[PDB]
Amino acid sequence: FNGLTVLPPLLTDEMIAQYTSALLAGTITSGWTFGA
């Protein structure tokens, strides 16, 4: 490092995986009705 820095993303990969899992389980069981 030479004065340049990288900042971590606010959402960790585990939470993103949780979002995707929730979306996918909802669309498996409910269909599209859970978007309205």
Next chain:
Amino acid sequence: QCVNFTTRTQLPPAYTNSFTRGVYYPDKVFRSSVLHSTQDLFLPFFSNVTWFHANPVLPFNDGVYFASTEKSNIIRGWIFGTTLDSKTQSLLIVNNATNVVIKVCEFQFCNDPFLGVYYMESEFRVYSSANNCTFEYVSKNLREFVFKNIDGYFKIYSKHTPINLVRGLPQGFSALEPLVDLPIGINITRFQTLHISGWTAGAAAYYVGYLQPRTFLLKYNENGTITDAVDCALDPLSETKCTLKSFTVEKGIYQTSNFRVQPTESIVRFPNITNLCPFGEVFNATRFA
């Protein structure tokens, strides 16, 4: 015309919080409803002051916030200079009913310099000798003053404010206005207060302070009178106000500055010693030629 004295009225210096006093108008420009961020020699917020009560000699350094409490025009005299003698140019100030009296030259101060009052008052015996000089100038209650000296200019600000509480400094804000300027500069290092009248005065409470370079954030009202000020390098809250240039800060996260760990010492090295010169034979030869 002065003598020595016996009753050494030496008292220890008590201490008290400085609070938010010592704000003056830096520039003579008019402004309206703006927050002009400026940096200058100020009295930092929330310090403690070398309170006094014969009268000791104090260093000048950058500046002095020479405040003073009084009833009916008590404090009169001021002596400034480097050596305080006739060898080096000295400065004398006398305040009175009118604005200002100033003399600028070498004098002869003894161990007991005082103006003296006669009871219809006429007495002047602070020094004894005055060889030569050129410049002279003529023009319950807390009397705040400031004494700056920058690049050959001597500046005196002032303010008068009624007070009711006995001991502590007021928890209020009052800016200082520019009063007197002189285009003369001397490398002043010390100053002293003058005593009034043998002298009989022990209840002369004058505070002292010191000024440092830093940055503030003044707020001018619609009439151009300073009514607020926010120090910058005080706490991790005022820094946000300084960097946002606003007095109210919304809920959130703001980046103020950055830090770096500093180096501690040096460990300079060198190649390991090898191949000593054959000076042993030369310096310890069996026989020199």
Next chain:
Amino acid sequence: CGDSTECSNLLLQYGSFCTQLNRALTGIAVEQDKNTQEVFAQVKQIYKT
């Protein structure tokens, strides 16, 4: 500058060039976070199979 005093003083008189640079980069980072949040956080609850 890289830990020097004279360089800082010389750069000081160049006006305020760093402030808007940091402003732009901060805007970029906030934009990245907003992008991710709006792409993924399309739902309110957390369902389970």
Next chain:
Amino acid sequence: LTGTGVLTESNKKFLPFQQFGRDIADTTDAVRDPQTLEILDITPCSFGGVSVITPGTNTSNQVAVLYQGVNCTEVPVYSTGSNVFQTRAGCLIGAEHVNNSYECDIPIGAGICASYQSII
């Protein structure tokens, strides 16, 4: 070989004739001392920005200071303040950890964010 940083203990291997390594873009990364012929390494001492978490000037006037991406070993007026906390984002000084779960008010980073009750 002028340079600043910390000199930990390295576990690499130098052939008997090198003197100092480097990694990429001409940055020194290891030195063998000229006397004991052992290899140390160099890591520049840390830096980083700071940030202030405030709940609103009107509501309160106490803040929490975040030191981004810095180990909570050499932080040092807020040298102690409140219970110092360590997180992937950095060292948080002035707020205390809570092992419950709420929504998010002020995104801090790395999967954590703070709010106002003190400051949690």
Next chain:
Amino acid sequence: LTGTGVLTESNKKFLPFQQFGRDIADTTDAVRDPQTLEILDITPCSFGG
């Protein structure tokens, strides 16, 4: 105070020690005449494409 423009009559009040006002970004907007001591104004004479 070298500058060009038109000088009109104003109503702003100066404390007895200021000389000239300004609004923002270091732009003179008022001035007190050094002889009669009244509050004038300043506006650069107009330009345009």
Next chain:
Amino acid sequence: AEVQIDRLITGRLQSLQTYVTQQLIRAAEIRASANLAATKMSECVLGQS
């Protein structure tokens, strides 16, 4: 030495500004892509297109 530091400062400022500009352009491209992805998620996942 002041002149030499001036040269260094000018060069490094130019490089930094160019880097920031490229970052801005690529960020705009990525934002367009993210908007497209959000539209696809809202239209193809949460319903039949």
Next chain:
Amino acid sequence: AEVQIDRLITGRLQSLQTYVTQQLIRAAEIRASANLAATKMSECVLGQS
């Protein structure tokens, strides 16, 4: 005076160029937003989407 004025001109030219570039970027983003707004007006207001 030639050298000093050249320095002033170069600095002000750099600042003006940066300002123009930022204006161009912001204009592009605003135009994208305006296209989105026109689409929304033409699809939701003038018919069921």
